[PDB]
Amino acid sequence: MALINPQFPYAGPVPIPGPAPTETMPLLNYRVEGRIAGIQQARQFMPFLQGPHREVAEQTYYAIGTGIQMGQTFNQPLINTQEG
Amino acid sequence: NNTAFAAVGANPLEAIYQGAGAADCEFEEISYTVYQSYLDQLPVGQNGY
Question: Where is it found, in Gene Ontology cellular component terms (chain A) (predicted)?
């Protein structure tokens, strides 16, 4: 967006020496076929386990029984003959 | 030193000093300073300047 100087104008570009025209043109680089080499193993001996863990520990229980329940020799009360 | 010091009898047209001792005169320094006076902030129409 330059302003044209009317007192000192200039013309378009003139030819100048050039950079040997084939040396600015590249070759198209020619890929050969390739292979991810080797026979891959199916599994890996991992350093960490792959499953979930638990944040807190919960107390577990198992039921037990008591035993054969016996009789008893109670201390027996007195007879309510109007004193009680 | 060959222009500015004319002897007694020499042409003083382009000299600066003239006298009987003008043979042994010498410049020491000359300084110049150039200032350009121009106009900026030029008006611009729809067809340029």
Answer: viral capsid
In angstroms, what is the resolution?
A: 2.8
> What Rg do the C-alpha atoms of chain A give, in angstroms?
52
Instruction: Tell me the technique behind this structure.
Output: cryo-EM
| CA quadruple A48, A50, A54, A57: dihedral, nearest 10 | -60
Nearest residue in B to A2, CA atom: B48
Rounded to a whole number of angstroms, the distance from the CA of B47 to the nearest CA of chain A is 9
CB-defined contacts A:B, below 8 A: 8
Q: What share of chain A is helix, strand, coil (3-state, %, to 5)?
A: 5, 0, 95
Identify all chain B residues contacting A8, using CB atoms and an 8 Å cutoff.
Answer: none
CB-CB neighbors (< 8 A) of B39 in chain A:
none
